[PDB]
Amino acid sequence: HEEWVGSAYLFVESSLDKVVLSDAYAHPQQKVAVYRALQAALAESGGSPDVLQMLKIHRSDPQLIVQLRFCGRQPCGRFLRAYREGALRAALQRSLAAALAQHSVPLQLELRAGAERLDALLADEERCLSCILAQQPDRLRDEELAELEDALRNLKCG
Amino acid sequence: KDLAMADLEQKVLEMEASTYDGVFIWKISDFPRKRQEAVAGRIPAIFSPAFYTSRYGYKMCLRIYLNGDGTGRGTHLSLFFVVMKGPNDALLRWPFNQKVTLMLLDQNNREHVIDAFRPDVTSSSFQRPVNDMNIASGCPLFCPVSKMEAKNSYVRDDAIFIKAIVDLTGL
Incomplete structure (x- = not known):
């Protein structure tokens, strides 16, 4: 409706x-x-x-x-x-490898919208989008991330 | 006779469990049994009695899935918050916009599982109720199953305690 928004878990x-x-x-x-x-x-x-x-x-x-x-x-x-x-x-x-001070940190990703595992639907982008829209965002950003954002910012100053 | 006594006993039960200060503690006994009924798909979820933000405030209840729901099906305990149709909704501010903190109490009172969230008011989960219950909102990945099923403090004497705290700031 009024503005396309959706959510999923990575x-x-x-x-x-x-x-x-x-x-x-x-x-x-x-x-x-x-x-x-x-x-x-x-x-x-x-x-x-x-x-x-x-x-x-x-x-x-x-x-x-x-x-x-x-x-x-x-x-x-x-x-x-x-x-x-x-x-x-x-x-x-690349970013995690640099973050944990390591040469390599190979990753395995998964993507889900509700019970729907999008990894098995990557070939149909329209279906994936439809599944993501079905999951209405219900919460604002968690306070913990704002706390980390402050920390990230205070560190880069000195 | 029944649509008779049955209804009255239900009212009393609901009355005995209700709180009017936005703080609810839900004791779920017979954990082991309810746990397996969930794992087997027979009874996937359980609703809690209703509670309110104030004497004539919002009506709410919790919905839990011992073996998970959505992105957490089969892997996590899923816990949800539900806005219900209250007798005084015409007097309240809509959409529902109070911070809600959900907790699984550690019975050694050391490390509780906690998720505090602020509603994203654009969700239908927070609009004035048209049906008995709005769509639930909450934590599909509230608690990984391993924490509440062998070796630790959340389950004790075959019972667990769920706690909800509705922040009343602005009310």
């Missing part, structure tokens, strides 16, 4: 055994960097921060689940193409 997971993202997040001195890595990767290959927003980051078994909010059906389409083509993943492997 599952991010490591391949090497140590590079466990769950613990890396709960780590007081890594969390900010991981946050920064996810934010930079999305803005690089997923879409601008005003068109692709992170609402929450779930530490959930040993992957990281990022709740996303998409603004505009067209921009969402750009995200989906970047996702299926591997561009999103390429940028995330």
Whole structure:
């Protein structure tokens, strides 16, 4: 209706055994960097921060689940193409690798809109978009991310 | 006889569970059993009794899926907040826009599972109710199943405690 918006969850997971993202997040001195890595990767290959927003980051078994909010059906389409083509993943492997001070951090991604696993629907972009729209964003950005944004910003000053 | 006694016993039950200060604690007993009924698909979800933000405030209830719903089906405990049609909705401000904090209480009172969220008022989940219940909103990935099913503090004596806190700022 009035403005096309939708949401989905992006599952991010490591391949090497140590590079466990769950613990890396709960780590007081890594969390900010991981946050920064996810934010930079999305803005690089997923879409601008005003068109692709992170609402929450779930530490959930040993992957990281990022709740996303998409603004505009067209921009969402750009995200989906970047996702299926591997561009999103390429940028995330680079940013996280730099974030955790490692040579490589190969990733395994998953994308879900409600119970629908979009990975099995990548060939039909219209179906993916329809599934994302079906998931109405119901929460504003989680306070934790604003807290990390403050931290990221205070650090870069000195 | 029944549409008789049955209804009266239900009212009393609802009355006994209701709170009017935006704070609700939901004790779910017989956890083990309810847990398996969920895992088996027989009874996927459970509604909690209703509670309110004030004596004549919003009417709300919680909806939980022991084996998950949506993106968390089969992997997480899913917990939701539901705005219900209240007897005094004509006097309230719509859409519903109060921060809601959902919690699974650690019975050693050390590390509670907590998710505080501010409603995105554009969602139909927060508009004035037309039906008994609006579409639920909440946490599909509230708590990974491993935390509440072997080895730890959330389940104790076959029971768990869910807590909800509706921030009354502005009311």
